[PDB]
C-alpha cells in the first residue's frame, strides 16, 4: 500500500506548495485558449484550484473535488475573494466519488493522474466517466516516467498513460509537455536529484504529457 494524504494535507495547510502557482498550469490554459474546453467543468484533483477559477471566471459552472479538506478551503477562499458563485468544491476521493451522474462536458486532470497508486487508476478512470456527459472531453497533465521515478509519485511511460486512459475514453492526442513549478532554492539536493528546468518568471518546469481524449 501507499498514501500521499497526509503530505497533500500538510503542504496545503503550510511556505506554499510548489504547484499551487496561481494560475492554470500553462499547457491546459493553451487548451482553453483553443476553445477546447466546453460546458459543466469537473477540475478533479483541483488543489486551490486555479484552473476551476479561471473557467468560472469566464462563464462555465465548474465543481473541484480533492480528497485534502485543506485544498478545498483555499479554493473556495479564492473563489470568495473574486465573488464566484458558479465555481464549487467538495471534498473527494477521485478514484470512488458519485453523485454526478452524466454531469460534464469536460473533466480535467492537473496533476493528479501521479499522485494516486497505480492500483486506484481503474476506479478513478470507472468515477470520472460515469460523471460524464455523452460526448464530453478529457484533459489529462502528468509527469513523464523518464523524468519522475518509481516512488511516492507513479509518473507514467507514453504507452503506460495510453493503454491505462484507452480503456475508458477515445484519445486525440498525447504529447510531450511540461509541468510548472515555483521550487524552494536547493529542492532536490545539489547537484539536484531530478532534472528541473529553469523557466521565466522564476518557474521551473519538469518532463511530462499532455492527453487530450473524448468520451466515445
Ligand atoms: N484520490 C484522490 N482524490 C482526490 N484528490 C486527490 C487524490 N489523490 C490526490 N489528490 C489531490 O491531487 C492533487 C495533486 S497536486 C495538483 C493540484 C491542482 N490540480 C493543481 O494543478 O495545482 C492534490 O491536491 C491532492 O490532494
Ligand atoms: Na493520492
Ligand atoms: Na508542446
Known amino acids: 500500500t501507499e498514501s500521499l ?3 497533500f494535507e500538510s503542504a496545503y495547510r503550510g511556505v506554499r506548495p510548489p504547484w499551487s502557482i496561481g494560475e492554470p498550469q500553462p499547457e491546459l490554459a493553451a487548451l482553453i485558449v483553443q476553445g477546447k474546453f466546453r460546458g459543466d467543468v ?4 483541483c488543489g486551490e484550484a486555479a484552473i476551476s477559477l479561471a473557467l468560472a471566471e469566464r462563464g462555465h459552472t465548474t465543481v473541484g473535488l480533492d480528497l485534502s479538506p485543506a485544498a478545498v478551503e483555499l479554493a473556495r477562499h479564492e473563489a470568495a475573494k ?3 458563485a458558479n465555481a464549487s468544491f467538495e471534498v473527494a476521493d477521485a478514484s470512488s466519488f458519485t453523485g454526478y451522474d452524466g454531469r460534464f462536458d469536460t473533466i480535467v486532470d492537473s496533476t493528479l493522474f501521479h499522485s494516486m497508486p497505480v492500483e486506484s487508476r481503474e476506479g478513478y478512470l470507472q468515477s470520472i466517466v460515469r460523471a460524464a456527459a455523452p460526448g464530453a472531453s478529457y484533459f489529462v497533465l502528468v509527469f513523464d516516467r523518464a523524468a519522475i521515478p518509481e516512488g511516492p509519485i507513479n509518473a507514467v511511460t507514453e504507452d503506460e498513460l495510453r493503454a491505462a486512459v484507452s480503456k475508458y475514453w477515445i484519445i486525440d492526442e498525447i504529447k510531450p509537455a511540461r509541468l510548472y513549478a515555483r521550487f524552494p532554492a536547493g529542492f532536490a539536493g545539489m547537484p539536484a536529484l531530478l532534472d528541473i528546468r529553469e523557466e521565466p518568471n522564476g518557474l521551473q518546469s519538469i518532463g511530462g ?3 487530450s481524449a473524448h468520451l466515445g
Open 209 to 211: 504529457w499532455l492527453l
Open 5 to 7: 494524504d497526509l503530505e
Open 42 to 45: 469537473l477540475d478533479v484533483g
Open 82 to 84: 473574486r465573488g464566484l
